[PDB]
């Protein structure tokens, strides 16, 4: 890690990620290099045991909307599993996909990027519906949560 540092408390812990939404759990940690570390994907309804690593930015990126996602009611996940490994359940909130969020999602699924500019919405409604979430989004959110600050 650079002069900018990352998770020091690191170790495999008894965990079981409980993907409890219709979307994939891509477990990721913003590593020492400020870079995403992916982990085995939990398909929809995938309870998979993990040697989960405490303090980590365990963002679980969905394959359905890939949004800012709340495992266990929060963007960040951490073990970390003990001698046996309860939740920890990485219980996956499929969020209650709101009106604007669900519009973003359907505009993701249906209209093309070439047709984002051709979208059947205002020039501003383009940005209102052309947003795309990223793994580095939850990476940076959990990095801020690692210190976070006021």
């Amino acid at each position: 890690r650079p002069v900018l540092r990352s998770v020091n408390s690191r170790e495999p812990s008894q965990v079981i990620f409980c993907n409890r939404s219709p979307r994939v759990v891509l477990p990721v940690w913003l590593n020492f290099d400020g870079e995403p570390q992916p982990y085995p994907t939990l398909p929809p309804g995938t309870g998979r045991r993990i040697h989960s690593y405490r303090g980590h930015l365990w963002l679980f990126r969905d394959a359905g909307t890939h949004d800012g996602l709340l495992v266990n009611q929060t963007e960040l996940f951490v073990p970390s599993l003990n001698v046996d490994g309860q939740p920890i359940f990485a219980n996956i909130t499929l969020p209650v996909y709101t009106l604007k969020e669900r519009c973003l999602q359907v505009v993701r699924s249906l209209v093309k990027p070439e047709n984002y500019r051709r979208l059947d919405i205002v020039r501003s409604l383009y940005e209102d519906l052309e947003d795309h979430p990223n793994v580095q989004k939850d990476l940076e959110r959990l990095t801020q949560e690692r210190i976070a600050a006021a």
């Binding site: 059947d120 919405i121 205002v122 020039r123 501003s124 409604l125 209102d128």
Partner: protein, 298 residues
């Protein structure tokens, strides 16, 4: 765009906006007709589909608000404290005017400022005052940022002196209505920038320096007077009651940290400058018990 024109829907919106806001710049009773006027105004502002229409909307809003506040600065050129509390009322109704603008602008708050603009990026359309006349932020904010030193510079040159004098007139004479002093300097300091980064920035700048000054001035001056000609046993009690009453006036107008600090400060100023008196009449009342100097000393 598809539903209607997406840049010149601004036209009707600014028509309705100017109409109503001029009805509600520091005046007056906000008639319903204009209420539905702004209902349809933010109607057309929401369906106006603004790339510039929002930045230009609150552009023209800032422009008219600057114009009306310069017109009101044209009205601060009037008499003494008559127009001082006239201008008290000026912002009294003009903060209300910007407020019901903002009630006309509340749904418009949801519409054309809060998504992706000056409201989220202050380094794009201009800094946080209002803007460089392409602003995207709230409207009482506009009134404050255009009203602050209309209050500060021209008016407070004499209004602060009037304040000091009539506050001193707690001893005889009087301030305005004992919150109207408080209300006036709250109007003044309320442009502690509308986020209210400080409570003292404009508080300091506006009154707190003459505030602290004449606090100490009158305090230790009357301390000298009552030391001279009050039978210092009664110097004690006179200074005490006087300080309490003036601190009451410091509850008439009040910055709950300023006047506490400085009032008690300059009371100590009064009372800490009479030295050998202390032990001398101390051991006196120790022997010749006198619960003026007993009570006041203790």
């Amino acid at each position: 765009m598809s539903l209607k024109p997406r840049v010149v829907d601004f036209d009707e919106t600014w028509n309705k906006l100017l109409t109503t806001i001029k009805a509600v710049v520091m005046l007056e009773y906000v008639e319903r007709a204009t209420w539905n006027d702004r209902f349809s105004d933010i109607y057309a502002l929401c369906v106006a589909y603004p790339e510039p229409l929002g930045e230009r909307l609150y552009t023209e809003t800032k422009i008219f608000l600057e114009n009306h506040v310069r017109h009101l600065h044209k009205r601060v050129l009037e008499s003494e404290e008559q127009v001082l509390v006239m201008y008290h009322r000026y912002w009294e109704e003009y903060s209300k005017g910007a407020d019901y603008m903002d009630c006309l602008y509340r749904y418009l708050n949801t519409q054309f400022i809060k998504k992706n603009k000056l409201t989220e990026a202050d380094l794009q359309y201009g800094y946080g005052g209002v803007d460089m006349n392409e602003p995207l932020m709230e409207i009482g904010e506009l009134a404050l940022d255009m009203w602050r030193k209309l209050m500060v510079e021209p008016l407070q040159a004499i209004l602060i002196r009037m304040l000091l004098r009539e506050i001193k007139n707690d001893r005889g004479g009087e301030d305005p209505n004992q919150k109207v002093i408080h209300g006036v300097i709250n109007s003044f300091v309320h442009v502690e920038q509308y986020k209210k980064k400080f409570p003292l920035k404009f508080y300091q700048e506006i009154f707190e320096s003459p505030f602290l000054t004449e606090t100490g001035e009158y305090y230790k001056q009357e301390a000298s007077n009552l030391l001279q000609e009050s039978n210092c046993s009664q110097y004690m009690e006179k200074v005490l009651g006087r300080l309490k009453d003036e601190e009451i006036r410091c509850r008439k107008y009040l910055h709950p940290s300023s006047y506490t600090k400085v009032i008690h400060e300059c009371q100590q100023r009064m009372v800490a400058d009479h030295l050998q008196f202390l032990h001398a009449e101390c051991h006196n009342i120790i022997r010749q018990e006198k619960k003026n100097d007993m009570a006041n000393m203790y």
